[PDB]
Design a protein around this ligand. Structure first.
Ligand SMILES: Nc1ncnc2c1ncn2[C@@H]1O[C@H](COP(=O)(O)OP(=O)(O)OP(=O)(O)O)[C@@H](O)[C@H]1O
Ligand SMILES: [Mg+2]
Lengths: 83, 115, 173, 458
């Protein structure tokens, strides 16, 4: 009964359209003092340039299990959660 | 329409939860009814989950959890120009002398970049 | 590890299931909730920082085999504290607390070769007097012990393997 | 088999199937772009996660890379195949020459020799250097530490010791560069090749450009080569270019390893990490290691934990003072803080022992007078107190010496001074035979005869 509920779950998540972010793409989770936390970016690498909205970058300093920690190469204050 | 609600109050530090698609940017100004006066909050940090963390620009006493919060979308804005001369103001640009309203022509945001 | 934070939720759910005389159902519900927790798409959603209520109602969406009145609530309580990854451990403690409540024990037996029913009788009948519980044996006979048997219940162990005697003798060096 | 699951600075976490988890100190391997990166296992976390330090640059590592499990520690070439060559922490050749003709490789993590194995020795080893073998002489098979702040002279002193000891000694030698200057590695290598002495010397370099994992384990690569030559039954000289960098590279990784900070923010394990390194550097009944270590002293604070722990490890300790060096007295040895286990009447004999304690007593009394002199001036002293000062100042100058390696700075030619000439000179000064000479007569002269010839021309 386990494999049929395991595939029913695969059907249901598809019905409700819940799906991953694309690799190389992510969202800002939190913003403080120019430090940025990002969820996603499953293909980001240590010390990469992450392009932000506008025309600016953050530098990936930590690849945590659930997030990337990054610092903004410029003014940070216009950034927002969910960009 | 107010869109946030207060979720913690620990001294001067007030935490407010907003809808996920509406979270104020840093250094913005919020306002709330502290009973019979409007109290301004300045945003310091965007935390996870729509919670933002703010410093009260006035007395924190008498705030409840669950009060409604209006997100003014600009920073703190103050009156400027000739109308300010000879007047005393607080940090919010409200007159602290008794001498009536300031005949402002503009209000500028206090947080801006250098030349 | 989620073992400590699963404990409060596991107990609540069991006592409630007792007062509502519905323990078998819940165990099925927790098993379902623990499988949706493992789905690879949901495991990204559970890791990202959604707001608790936007996450919970999205979690409730992917389960329709849940008792909504009592089972959606459980999910909503865990979501409000971010705990949903503890569901596979909440399940295991629910099963554990149930077996203590039913005064019943699983016991594992390991030997160089398969036992007779008469030996399995004497083992079970002894262990029920050791434990003062009912017992249910399972036998997991092994390639490396060359004679004798091991008995494990809970974490108490009795060893009569010759493997254990050869080392326990060499220890007298 | 493994997957990378976090990358935090120098530290990489790897997940393995729970039946296959690597042992502590295993080497792992991962492809990082167009090169191969080794990782060393530090800790086993739960759930098959294992926490590791990168032996190289960790930038460009993704999460989700496949990691290969090597079944063994980091192992380095040892024996005569290593002689005359420059090697990496991983024991790779770093000179442009071919592969190392190894016959054997040894794991860099080893246990210290047992208490039964150790050997005592009292054979005094002579040096060219007046202050060192007068005040803090040392034996064949002993440990010496040169303590000092930034720029005080630790390296120039060790370069005279290499010149004096390691060329009248006949056996093999190991020089380990640990977190020091790459220029000074290149400079040293060329003077060895120009002198054709290179073929007796093994060089391990992990200089200060290298990422922390290299700086931490290069010390152990250096010892593992010296332990091969010792166990072969030889007498070996080990030079360590800065031991402090071993501890500091531990500090840099320790927070990322998840360990609560201690004291002045050091790792909590500081004394064990130092102790397990230091105990391997011992002479044994099979063979001997003579060791010289430079010890950087951060912010000149001799009471900082890292200097303080190092002092119990060593047999002779020479302390270099910025306050003396700014006089331009070189070597800037402080004789009131430098000390040795060998300054004992039984081993040195009485004439040496009495001369050293006389010098120590006069120079101590001069420190006691300087706070009087600083306010009142010297005229207020007693006529015996003035004689202590007049002698102590001569003694401080006569402790100075021209080094052969220093000629590129001083210009004046280097001097080698016998132990017989040093004790005779200081004993003569303290007896007052020379109280008619000026202070400048004693500055930078090799022997007491050279002082009287300098005095004739003032
Ligand atoms: N005996 C000496 N004669 C002349 N100059 C010296 C002598 N000893 C040291 N000095 C001067 O001190 C300076 C630095 O000495 P050295 O390079 O040995 O310090 P160091 O050990 O490298 O210090 P650090 O490792 O902290 O940089 C050099 O300019 C050197 O000329
Ligand atoms: Mg140096």
């Amino acid at each position: 009964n386990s494999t049929e509920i395991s595939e029913l779950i695969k059907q249901r998540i598809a019905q409700f359209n819940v799906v991953s972010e694309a690799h190389n793409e992510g969202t800002i989770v939190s913003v403080s003092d120019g430090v940025i936390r990002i969820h996603g970016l499953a293909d980001a690498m240590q010390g990469e340039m992450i392009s932000l909205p506008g025309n600016r970058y953050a530098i990936a300093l930590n690849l945590e299990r659930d997030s990337v920690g990054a610092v903004v190469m410029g003014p940070y204050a216009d950034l927002a959660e969910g960009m | 329409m107010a869109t946030g609600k207060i979720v913690q109050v620990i001294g001067a530090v007030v935490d407010v939860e907003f809808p996920q698609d509406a979270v104020p940017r840093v250094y913005d100004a919020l306002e709330v009814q502290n009973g019979n006066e409007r109290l301004v909050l300045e945003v310091q940090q965007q935390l996870g989950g729509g919670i933002v963390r703010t410093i009260a620009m006035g007395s924190s006493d008498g705030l409840r959890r669950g009060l409604d919060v209006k997100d003014l979308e600009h920073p703190i804005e103050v009156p400027v120009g000739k109308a300010t001369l000879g007047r005393i103001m607080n940090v919010l640009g409200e007159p602290v002398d008794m001498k009536g309203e300031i005949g402002e022509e503009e209000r500028w945001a206090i947080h801006r970049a250098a030349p | 590890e989620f073992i400590t934070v699963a404990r409060p939720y596991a107990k609540a759910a069991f006592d409630f299931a007792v007062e509502h005389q519905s323990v078998e159902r819940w165990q099925d519900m927790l098993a379902f909730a623990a499988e949706v927790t493992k789905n690879e798409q949901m495991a990204e959603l559970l890791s990202g920082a959604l707001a608790p209520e936007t996450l919970a109602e999205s979690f409730i969406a992917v389960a329709g085999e849940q008792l909504d009145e009592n089972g959606q609530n459980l999910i909503r309580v865990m979501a409000e504290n971010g705990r949903l990854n503890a569901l596979p451990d909440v399940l295991e403690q629910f099963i554990h607390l149930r077996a203590v409540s039913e005064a019943t024990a699983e016991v594992d037996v390991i030997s160089a070769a398969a036992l007779s029913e008469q030996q399995l009788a004497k083992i079970s009948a002894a262990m029920e007097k050791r434990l003062s519980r009912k017992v249910k044996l399972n036998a997991k006979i092994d390639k490396s012990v060359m004679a004798g048997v091991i008995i494990r219940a809970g974490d108490m162990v009795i060893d009569g393997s010759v493997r254990g005697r050869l080392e326990r003798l060499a220890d007298v060096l | 088999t493994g997957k990378i699951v976090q990358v935090i600075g120098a530290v990489v976490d790897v997940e393995f199937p729970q039946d296959a988890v690597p042992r502590v100190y295993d080497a792992l391997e991962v492809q990082n772009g167009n090169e191969r990166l080794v990782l060393e296992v530090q800790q086993q976390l739960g759930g098959g996660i294992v926490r590791t330090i990168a032996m190289g640059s960790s930038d460009g590592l993704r999460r989700g890379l496949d990691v290969k499990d090597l079944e063994h520690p980091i192992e380095v070439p040892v024996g005569k195949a290593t002689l005359g060559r420059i090697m990496n922490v991983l024991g790779e050749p770093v000179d442009m020459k071919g592969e190392i003709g190894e016959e054997e490789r040894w794991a860099i993590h080893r246990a210290a020799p047992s208490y039964e194995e150790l050997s005592n020795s009292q054979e005094l080893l002579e040096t060219g250097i007046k202050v060192i073998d007068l005040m803090a002489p040392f034996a064949k098979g002993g440990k010496v530490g040169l303590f000092g702040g930034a720029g005080v002279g630790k390296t120039v002193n060790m370069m005279e010791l290499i010149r004096n000891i390691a060329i009248e000694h006949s056996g093999y030698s190991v020089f380990a560069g640990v977190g020091e200057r790459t220029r000074e590695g290149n400079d040293f290598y060329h003077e060895m090749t120009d002198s054709n002495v290179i073929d007796k010397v093994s060089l391990v370099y992990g200089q200060m450009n290298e990422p922390p994992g290299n700086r931490l384990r290069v010390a152990l690569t250096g010892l593992t080569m010296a332990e091969k030559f010792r166990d072969e039954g030889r007498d070996v000289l080990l030079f360590v270019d800065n031991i402090y960098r071993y501890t500091l590279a531990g500090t840099e990784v320790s927070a990322l390893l998840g360990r609560m900070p201690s004291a002045v923010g050091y790792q909590p394990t500081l004394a064990e990490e130092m102790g397990v390194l230091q105990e391997r550097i011992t002479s044994t009944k099979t063979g001997s290691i003579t060791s010289v270590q430079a010890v950087y002293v951060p912010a000149d604070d001799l009471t900082d934990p890292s200097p303080a722990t190092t002092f119990a490890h060593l047999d002779a300790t020479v302390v270099l003072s910025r306050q003396i060096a700014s006089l331009g007295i070189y070597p800037a040895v402080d004789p009131l803080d430098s000390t040795s286990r060998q300054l004992d009447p039984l081993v040195v004999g009485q004439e040496h022992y009495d001369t050293a304690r006389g010098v120590q007593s006069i120079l101590q009394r001069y420190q006691e007078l300087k706070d009087i002199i600083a306010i009142l001036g010297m005229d207020e002293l007693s006529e015996e107190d003035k004689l202590v000062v007049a002698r102590a100042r001569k003694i401080q100058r006569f402790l100075s010496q021209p080094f052969f390696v220093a000629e590129v700075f001083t210009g004046s030619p280097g001097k080698y001074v016998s132990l017989k000439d040093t004790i005779r000179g200081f004993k003569g000064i303290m007896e007052g035979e020379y109280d008619h000479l000026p202070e400048q007569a004693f500055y930078m002269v090799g022997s007491i005869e050279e002082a009287v010839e300098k005095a004739k021309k003032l």
